[PDB]
Amino acid sequence: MKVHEIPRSQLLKIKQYEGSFVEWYRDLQEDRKKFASLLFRWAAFGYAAREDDGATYISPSQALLERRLLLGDAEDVAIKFLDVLFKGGAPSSSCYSLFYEDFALRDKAKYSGAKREFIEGLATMPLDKIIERIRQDEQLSKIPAEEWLILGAEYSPEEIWEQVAPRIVNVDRSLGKQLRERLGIKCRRPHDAGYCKILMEVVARQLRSHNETYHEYLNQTHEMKTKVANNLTNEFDLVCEFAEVLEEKNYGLGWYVLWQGVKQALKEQKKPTKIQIAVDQLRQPKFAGLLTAKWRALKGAYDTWKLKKRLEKRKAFPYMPNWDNDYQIPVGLTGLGVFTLEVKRTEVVVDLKEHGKLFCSHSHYFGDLTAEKHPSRYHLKFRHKLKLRKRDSRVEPTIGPWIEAALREITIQKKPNGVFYLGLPYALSHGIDNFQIAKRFFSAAKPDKEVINGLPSEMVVGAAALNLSNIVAPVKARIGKGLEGPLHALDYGYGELIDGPKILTPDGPRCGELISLKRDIVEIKSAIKEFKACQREGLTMSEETTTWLSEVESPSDSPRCMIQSRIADTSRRLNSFKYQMNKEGYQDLAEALRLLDAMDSYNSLLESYQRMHLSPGEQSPKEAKFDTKRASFRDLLRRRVAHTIVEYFDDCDIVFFEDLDGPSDSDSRNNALVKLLSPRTLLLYIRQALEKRGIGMVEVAKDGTSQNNPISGHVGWRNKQNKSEIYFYEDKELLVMDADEVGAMNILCRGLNHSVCPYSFVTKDYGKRVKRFLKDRYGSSNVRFLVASMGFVTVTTALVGKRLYYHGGELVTHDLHNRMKDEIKYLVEKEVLARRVSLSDSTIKSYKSFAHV
RNA sequence: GUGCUGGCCGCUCUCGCUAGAGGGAGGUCAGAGCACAUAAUAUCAAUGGAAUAUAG
DNA sequence: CTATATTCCATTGATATTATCATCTAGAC
DNA sequence: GTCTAGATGATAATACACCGTT
Numbered sequence: 001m002k003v004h005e006i007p008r009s010q011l012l013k014i015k016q017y018e019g020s021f022v023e024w025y026r027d028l029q030e031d032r033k034k035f036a037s038l039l040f041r042w043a044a045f046g047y048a049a050r051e052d053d054g055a056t057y058i059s060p061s062q063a064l065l066e067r068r069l070l071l072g073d074a075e076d077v078a079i080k081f082l083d084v085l086f087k088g089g090a091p092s093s094s095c096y097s098l099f100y101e102d103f104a105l106r107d108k109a110k111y112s113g114a115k116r117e118f119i120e121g122l123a124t125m126p127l128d129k130i131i132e133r134i135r136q137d138e139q140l141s142k143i144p145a146e147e148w149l150i151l152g153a154e155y156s157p158e159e160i161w162e163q164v165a166p167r168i169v170n171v172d173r174s175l176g177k178q179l180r181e182r183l184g185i186k187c188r189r190p191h192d193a194g195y196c197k198i199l200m201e202v203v204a205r206q207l208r209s210h211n212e213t214y215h216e217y218l219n220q221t222h223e224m225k226t227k228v229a230n231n232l233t234n235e236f237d238l239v240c241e242f243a244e245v246l247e248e249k250n251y252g253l254g255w256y257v258l259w260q261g262v263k264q265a266l267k268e269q270k271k272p273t274k275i276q277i278a279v280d281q282l283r284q285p286k287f288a289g290l291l292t293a294k295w296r297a298l299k300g301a302y303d304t305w306k307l308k309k310r311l312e313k314r315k316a317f318p319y320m321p322n323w324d325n326d327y328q329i330p331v332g333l334t335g336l337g338v339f340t341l342e343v344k345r346t347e348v349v350v351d352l353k354e355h356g357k358l359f360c361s362h363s364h365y366f367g368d369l370t371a372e373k374h375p376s377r378y379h380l381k382f383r384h385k386l387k388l389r390k391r392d393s394r395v396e397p398t399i400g401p402w403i404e405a406a407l408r409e410i411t412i413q414k415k416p417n418g419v420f421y422l423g424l425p426y427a428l429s430h431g432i433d434n435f436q437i438a439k440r441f442f443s444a445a446k447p448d449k450e451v452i453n454g455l456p457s458e459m460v461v462g463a464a465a466l467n468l469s470n471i472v473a474p475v476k477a478r479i480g481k482g483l484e485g486p487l488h489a490l491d492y493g494y495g496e497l498i499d500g501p502k503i504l505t506p507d508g509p510r511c512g513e514l515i516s517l518k519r520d521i522v523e524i525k526s527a528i529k530e531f532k533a534c535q536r537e538g539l540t541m542s543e544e545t546t547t548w549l550s551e552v553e554s555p556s557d558s559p560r561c562m563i564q565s566r567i568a569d570t571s572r573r574l575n576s577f578k579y580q581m582n583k584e585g586y587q588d589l590a591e592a593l594r595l596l597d598a599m600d601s602y603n604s605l606l607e608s609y610q611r612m613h614l615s616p617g618e619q620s621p622k623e624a625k626f627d628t629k630r631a632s633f634r635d636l637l638r639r640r641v642a643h644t645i646v647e648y649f650d651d652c653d654i655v656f657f658e659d660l661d662g663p664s665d666s667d668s669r670n671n672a673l674v675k676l677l678s679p680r681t682l683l684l685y686i687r688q689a690l691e692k693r694g695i696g697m698v699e700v701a702k703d704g705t706s707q708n709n710p711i712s713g714h715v716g717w718r719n720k721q722n723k724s725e726i727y728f729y730e731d732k733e734l735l736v737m738d739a740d741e742v743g744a745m746n747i748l749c750r751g752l753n754h755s756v757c758p759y760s761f762v763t764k765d766y767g768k769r770v771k772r773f774l775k776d777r778y779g780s781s782n783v784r785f786l787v788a789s790m791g792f793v794t795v796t797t798a799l800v801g802k803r804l805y806y807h808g809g810e811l812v813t814h815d816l817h818n819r820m821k822d823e824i825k826y827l828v829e830k831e832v833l834a835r836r837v838s839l840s841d842s843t844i845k846s847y848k849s850f851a852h853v
Numbered sequence: 854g855u856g857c858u859g860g861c862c863g864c865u866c867u868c869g870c871u872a873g874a875g876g877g878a879g880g881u882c883a884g885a886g887c888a889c890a891u892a893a894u895a896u897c898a899a900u901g902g903a904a905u906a907u908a909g
Numbered sequence: 910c911t912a913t914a915t916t917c918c919a920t921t922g923a924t925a926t927t928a929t930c931a932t933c934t935a936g937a938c
Numbered sequence: 939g940t941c942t943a944g945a946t947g948a949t950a951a952t953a954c955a956c957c958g959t960t
Contacts, residue, residue: 007929009891013854090947103945110933110946118948137948173946193944201928206893209927213895216925220896250906252914259960260913272909274912295958303957310897321894328892334930335944363854365889376931387854390885398887409929413892421854423891425929436952443953533910556872564874571874579859585886586857604901610875611903613868620903622918625876631921632856639888659954663899663922671899671922680923688890701955755954762957769954803958814959 005406005427006692012348012360014412014420019356024195025329025414027188031199033323035187036206042067043082043207045214046317054315074182081175085204086211091170096200098176101190105177109139109169111161119161122152139168194337201336202327210321217318221311228308235293235301242287243305251277255667258302262291296801328413328423333376339410341378343371350410350422360422367399371407378407380426404429430694434653438696442654445756445769447491455492457481462649463656463748464504465740468677469511471590471641473740474648475501475748486847489752500840501741504648507590510581514594517577520570521601523548525608528563532612567609574598589641596634597676638678642685646693655690656751657683658702658743700750701769704759708807710737710745710839713848715807715817717824727834729824734834745839749850757852762803777852791816809848 044063048054071078085095097103118133118140130145140148143164151160179185189195243253257278264273265282273279281287290298331337331352340351348369350358362369367385371378384400411423433456441447441455458480465473476499479489485496527545534541541559549562552569577595586592611620649655660679663671683699690697707716709728716728718739726742728735750757758770763785765771771781774795783797785804791813793804805817 001930007890009929010889011854011891093946097945106934106945112947113932114948133948140948170946197944202893205927207927209894212926217896246914250915254913256960257913272912276908276913278913299958315896318895323894325893328928330929332930334932335946336930338943361854365854384889386887387889388886393885395886411891411929421891423929425891427929440952445954530910554872556870558870558872560869561872561874564869564872567874575859579884582858583884583886585888587886600901606875607902610867614903616904618904619917622902623876624919629857634921636857636888643888662924665898672901675900675922678922684923692890699954764957767955801957818959 004430004432006430007425007427008692009411009423009425010363010365011421011423012363012366014358014360014422015347016359017356017420019352020354021352021356021358024352024355025412028195028199028202028329029326031187032202032206032327035199035203036323039082039203039207040210040320041070042078043086043211045210045320047320048315048317050319054319057316060317071183074179077175077179077182080172081179084172084175086208088204088208091173092204094173095176095204096193096196097174098180098185099187099190099196099199100177100193101180102193103177105174107169108165111165115161119157122148122157122160125152139170142167194331194335197336198329198331202329206321206323206327214318221314224307224311228304228311231300231304233297233301233304235290235297236304238287238290239301239305240308242281243309245281246278249277253278253305255302266291294801326414328411330409330411332409340373341371341407341410342373343369358420358422366424376408380405380407428692434694434696435691438654438698442696442698442751442754445754445772452491455481456653459654460498460652461495461654461656461748461751462652463744463751464645465743465747466657466660466677466679466682467740468593468673469507469590470503470740472504472645472648473501473744474504474645475499475741475744476649476652477748479752486844487748487752488847488851488853490754490756490853492752495752497840500838501738501744502840503740504644505588505590508588510577510588511591511594514577514591514598517570517573518594518597518601520566521598521605524563524566524570525601525605528605528609528612531560531563536616567605570602570605574602586636586640589637589644592637593676596637599630600676634678638682638685639689641682642689645686646689646695649690649695650693652695654696654698654751656698656700656747657686658705658747659683659699660702698751700747700755705746705750706739706743708742708746708759708849710742710749710847710849711837711844713808713851715805715820716742717821717828719828727824727828729820729827734827734832736834736836737839741839745847746849749847753850753852755850757850758806759850760803760805762801763799764801773852785811787813791819809852 041063044060044067046058046060046063048057068075081095081098085092097105127145127149130148134140134143134145134148151164155163187196187199239253239258246252257275260273260275261278261282264275264279265287269279290301293301331339333339338353342349342351346362348360348362350360352358364385364387366380366382369380369382371380380403382403384403386395386398388395388397405426405428407424407426409425411425413421413423415421436451437455440451459478461477461479463475467473475497477487477495477497479487479493479495481493483494483496485494487495487497489495527549530545531541546559546562549559549566552562552566554561554565577598581587581592581595614620645655660677660683661674662678662680663674687697707718707726708714709716709730712728712730714728714730716726716737719725719727724739726737726739728737754769756769756773756776758773761770765774774781774783778795780797783795785793785799786796787799788794793811793813795811803814805812805814807817807820
């Protein structure tokens with residue numbers, strides 16, 4: 001049920017409601033946000049005061065000292081009630097008895113099916129099997145095993161069941177009822193059952209959302225403390241006291257400062273260096289210990305200091321949740337409320353029995369929707385339709401394939417603009433075949449024979465690249481057990497291409513016009529900044545700045561009129577690329593990402609242009625504009641790219657992707673450029689689109705997947721001038737390939753080999769992905785390494801903490817790796833002509849890249 | 854059904870003027886293809902701006 | 910004027926939790 | 939019989955990695 005089904009959802013807006021529906025909704029919301037606070041104040045939770053931004057906090061002890069006054073003699077009961085609702089599951093089905101007045105318990109337990117199959121064969125089942133079955137089940141654990149055996153032996157199954165039922169009844173199932181009598185709890189509809197069932201099931205979700213976050217945070221604030229407490233070194237203390245003195249003189253320490261200071265401390269400068277305080281402080285003999293310290297220890301001393309600094313900025317406890325925002329009310333078909341759905345020609349009717357009907361519109365996401373009632377579910381058939389809002393259109397209306405799903409619940413929610421929405425969570429049906437093949441086999445470096453014997457006899461596989469430019473570069477293939485071809489797949493056999501590497505979509509002609517329009521904005525920003533900082537000293541503009549300002553025609557010839565005209569020029573030149581690239585419905589995806597950065601820099605330009613008139617020494621707080629037009633144009637660009645990848649690999653079983661890394665901390669200098677691509681959400685939007693069609697997906701390591709030879713496994717040099725070319729030097733000959741195709745082919749190659757073959761590692765090799773490699777190729781997982789010859793190595797059973805590479809099948813040293821790149825470079829500036837080779841042509845015999853067998 | 858777009862006109866805020874640029878709200882003319890898993894809570898990092906030290 | 914660095918304020922990228930029922934059972938007609 | 943609501947349901951699974959070199 002919830003194993004081989006894909007849960008998706010969508011919403012229909014409720015056009016009109018009749019009956020007591022609004023009273024039903026608002027009572028539920030108000031009772032939820034009241035009893036959530038009441039339950040939060042029972043289970044003593046520590047929390048930080050929102051008033052002072054967590055400067056002070058409420059301890060977990062005064063919460064107990066206050067619950068004692070708030071609750072009274074009922075501490076024992078409430079503790080059990082909270083635990084039962086926190087653990088959840090099946091046993092928490094009868095907790096709605098706290099809000100219901102007409103609740104009726106059952107002194108006899110329900111005769112479940114498992115009880116049935118436990119009853120037919122109790123007599124013919126020996127004593128050693130009367131302990132394992134019952135040690136887990138709590139209900140059955142109320143009777144000793146020997147009593148079970150004797151009862152089964154000398155009684156009739158009916159008279160075992162009739163006798164044994166009263167004891168196995170859970171006693172704490174009326175706990176929520178008895179608490180209501182003890183405290184006199186009054187909800188708003190005490191004589192209704194669906195209301196109570198909905199209310200308790202919604203309150204429990206919001207409390208179990210905070211319980212797991214609380215207990216996780218209070219543990220996460222301990223591992224960092226331990227990690228700092230372990231990494232104590234001399235370099236750590238040196239860096240810490242250096243940071244302390246720089247903070248005494250309000251400088252502070254950064255990684256760039258920690259390397260420039262070290263290097264420039266030894267030498268002497270003439271012009272004032274960007275950093276002077278730090279280098280001067282390094283001049284002192286106090287900080288001479290770290291000058292001879294190894295780099296590996298220095299990194300562990302700096303990272304430990306950064307981690308210790310982050311921990312000092314932690315609140316004692318998480319904030320208290322904000323219950324004010326409305327929840328999403330669920331109503332089902334078996335007990336948890338009730339509804340009937342029946343599709344008409346022009347409307348969809350939802351009938352809440354005593355709470356009135358709801359009339360809903362049709363959508364193009366549920367086109368041609370038909371619903372047939374079944375015993376405890378619905379059957380849906382709908383086709384996605386093209387949403388042509390233009391009355392007269394010039395595009396042919398497209399339809400989609402039939403989709404079948406089972407619907408069993410609906411949701412109602414109220415948006416802040418007072419519009420109710422009906423949500424239909426529907427589950428699609430697909431095989432669990434290839435998801436298991438992807439997750440179980442293609443990802444694990446050491447799959448077991450249990451799955452290996454069950455691998456299919458044929459497959460289709462693919463690969464792709466994701467970059468800011470040339471977004472998708474795919475390659476198709478076909479592997480097959482008992483088949484011969486160039487590609488090699490570990491533990492499975494061989495393979496062969498069916499569609500050679502290429503570029504799915506080249507970047508459009510408008511993608512180069514949008515990259516200079518951002519330089520214009522950045523330079524006009526700095527120009528305006530200098531145009532403001534200069535007036536403080538009453539100086540004069542630089543000639544080059546004025547000449548730059550001159551070209552755009554201004555009404556006057558004032559400099560501050562030139563910038564004011566250029567700001568208008570850029571606005572009028574960006575608004576031309578919105579209406580003109582929207583008219584086409586955002587056709588080319590590559591050029592629709594540069595426009596996003598155009599917008600982003602334009603907002604900062606205006607943000608700094610609205611403050612050009614200020615005076616020194618004051619402060620200018622922002623103003624909170626209300627907009628969501630930048631989070632709704634970015635959420636379309638990560639869906640279109642996901643759909644484009646899926647539609648191409650529609651006749652494939654598995655697709656291989658590299659695991660890109662998201663934006664990082666302040667040390668990295670390119671956080672503002674990987675936030676445009678947003679790789680980690682793009683890889684999440686791709687996965688859902690693939691999963692909707694029963695296709696697996698594997699993420700392989702990206703280390704060095706763009707600087708090898710797909711054929712021979714040798715290293716290559718990437719031209720800095722031209723970023724779409726990579727050069728190789730083999731057999732005293734110079735070869736040329738394409739850069740992105742090399743990435744796609746290497747992604748496929750490490751996909752088929754489970755990426756178990758390494759690219760670069762630094763000897764202490766502690767890793768399920770390299771340990772198996774050492775055994776499979778060299779012979780032992782535990783081996784020592786000693787350098788020899790001209791830069792090769794000889795694996796034996798010394799060097800510690802060194803960066804060893806791998807090219808051509810033999811490990812090398814870092815110096816040799818640099819020198820091969822240098823010789824390729826030295827030869828390429830000698831203008832030696834090279835011949836291009838293709839990865840899609842035939843007559844290639846093997847693919848040794850990232851292969852190690 | 855949700856989402857994403859500009860031309861143009863008065864009103865009203867912000868700044869400056871040898872001169873105009875930006876924000877909010879409204880009216881009107883057009884354009885309009887292609888994607889859609891929908892929500893509640895909590896935590897971390899940074900981006901952008903402003904000011905302040907500074908040294909040199 | 911170009912770097913390093915401190916405080917304030919939205920706003921964004923990213924990842925964790927909570928969810929997307931089934932099967933007796935007693936009463937009316 | 940056939941609906942139609944209210945009160946109660948064994949366990950119930952799947953990968954891997956950070957340690958220089960701009």
